[PDB]
Coordinates of C-alpha atoms and ligand atoms in Angstrom, one line a residue:
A1 CA -16.2 -1.6 19.9
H2 CA -17.2 -3.4 16.8
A3 CA -16.4 -4.0 13.1
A4 CA -13.7 -1.4 12.5
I5 CA -11.7 -2.3 15.6
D6 CA -11.9 -6.0 14.7
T7 CA -10.6 -5.3 11.2
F8 CA -7.6 -3.3 12.5
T9 CA -6.8 -5.8 15.2
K10 CA -6.9 -8.8 12.9
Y11 CA -5.4 -7.4 9.7
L12 CA -2.9 -5.0 11.0
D13 CA -1.9 -7.7 13.6
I14 CA -1.9 -5.2 16.5
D15 CA -3.3 -5.1 20.0
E16 CA -7.0 -4.1 20.4
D17 CA -6.1 -1.1 22.6
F18 CA -4.3 0.6 19.7
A19 CA -6.9 -0.5 17.2
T20 CA -9.3 1.4 19.5
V21 CA -7.1 4.5 19.4
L22 CA -7.2 4.4 15.6
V23 CA -11.0 4.5 15.6
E24 CA -11.0 7.3 18.2
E25 CA -8.7 9.2 16.0
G26 CA -11.2 9.0 13.1
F27 CA -9.9 6.0 11.1
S28 CA -12.3 3.2 10.1
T29 CA -11.0 1.3 7.0
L30 CA -7.8 -0.4 5.8
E31 CA -7.8 1.8 2.7
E32 CA -7.2 4.8 5.0
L33 CA -4.3 3.2 6.8
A34 CA -2.8 2.1 3.6
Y35 CA -3.2 5.2 1.4
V36 CA -3.7 8.4 3.5
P37 CA -0.6 10.6 3.6
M38 CA 1.9 9.6 6.3
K39 CA 2.0 13.1 7.8
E40 CA -1.6 12.5 8.8
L41 CA -1.0 9.1 10.5
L42 CA 2.0 10.6 12.2
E43 CA -0.4 12.9 14.1
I44 CA -1.8 10.2 16.3
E45 CA -0.2 9.6 19.7
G46 CA 2.0 6.5 20.0
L47 CA 3.0 6.3 16.3
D48 CA 6.4 7.0 14.9
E49 CA 7.4 6.6 11.2
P50 CA 8.8 3.1 11.2
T51 CA 5.7 1.7 12.8
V52 CA 3.5 3.7 10.5
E53 CA 5.2 2.2 7.5
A54 CA 4.9 -1.3 8.9
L55 CA 1.1 -0.7 9.5
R56 CA 0.7 0.6 5.9
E57 CA 2.4 -2.4 4.5
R58 CA 0.2 -4.7 6.5
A59 CA -2.9 -2.7 5.5
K60 CA -1.9 -3.1 1.8
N61 CA -1.3 -6.9 2.2
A62 CA -4.7 -7.2 4.0
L63 CA -6.5 -5.5 1.1
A64 CA -5.0 -7.8 -1.4
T65 CA -5.9 -10.8 0.7
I66 CA -9.5 -9.7 1.3
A67 CA -10.0 -9.0 -2.4
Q68 CA -9.5 -12.8 -2.9
Ligands
AU1 AU1 5.8 7.7 19.7

């Protein structure tokens, strides 16, 4: 458990356990969480649309913040 998990945990403001699930599901960057079609994110266990939209918003805000 390294870089990718730490990024999701810190910038998406979620628990490490779920950040770990994201990596196991094949995700590794904020760009993916923010821009990949929702239908895809909705395929991972534990996620429903409202939460996916919240995570996408956080991913977008994180990218803007990091760019600074
Ligand atoms: Au669910």
